[PDB]
Amino acid sequence: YPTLRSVTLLEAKGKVKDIAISRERITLKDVLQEGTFGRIFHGILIDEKQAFVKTVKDQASEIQVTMMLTESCKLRGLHHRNLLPITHVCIEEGEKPMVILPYMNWGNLKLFLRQCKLVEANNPQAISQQDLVHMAIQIACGMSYLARREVIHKDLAARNCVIDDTLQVKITDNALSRDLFPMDYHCLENRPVRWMALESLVNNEFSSASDVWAFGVTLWELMTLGQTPYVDIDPFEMAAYLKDGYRIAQPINCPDELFAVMACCWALDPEERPKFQQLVQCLTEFHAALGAYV
16 A cells, blocks of 8 residues: 655765765855855866866755755766766865856856846847847757756756857756856745746746746847846746736847747747747757848
8 A cells, every 4th residue: 555745965965975075176266145044155176177066055955955966966977068067066164165167257157148238238239139039049059958858857947057268058957057147046945936837836846848948038138138037927926927918028139039939938838939949949040040140
């Protein structure tokens, strides 16, 4: 007869033990982001390579440190130029754990978009839709690699991407994202309500198709240079507003046809939304088109 139906810190350290190295090989330099308990450094790894380093403050509880480690593994063992998996950890007993990743020197994609948005204020015809779509293509190309391997990201958003000075984008794990971008998660459990498909909101169901819904919102983030979506909508009414057939407004200066792509991702029936592979194909076409037709 059956029964109807919790990770510990040591268990979480256990899952990363095979890429553990000694702290002494790590030199932290500047703090790039910081929240209530979490903190992202730019650091140096001696064989020197440059790295992101995720870590915690002294105020961090065992529960938060544990979820940092477990969430850091979302992308372990995957190898794709548009994915940023972790490469090492430091988990010595009695010390604050650190997660180590390859560095992307223009940092968080969302914070980067907003810095550009400040440029656009006094240079209005300065932003390149082709450049933005180039970012969208890469994101879809990494998601396609995840979706084909039945890996569900569940938190695709611009705040979980990074970009370097060659305009290459990589999707990251979401460790510390709730502590670093608290305004984007709501209790309605602390969830990215504004990026979530209606069926994830209502039934707690996640799939590549709900990943595709969040890609649609992430494409909207790109075309608005990082606008917080659904600012005028109370998170408790997000599901009701979606059921009544309402969607976010088309970004200014964004082609009708590209907005149609992101609307396609927000179909209520999950099986009507496109696949990431079709998205890669289509946005690729769009990239050439946005070069020739300004």
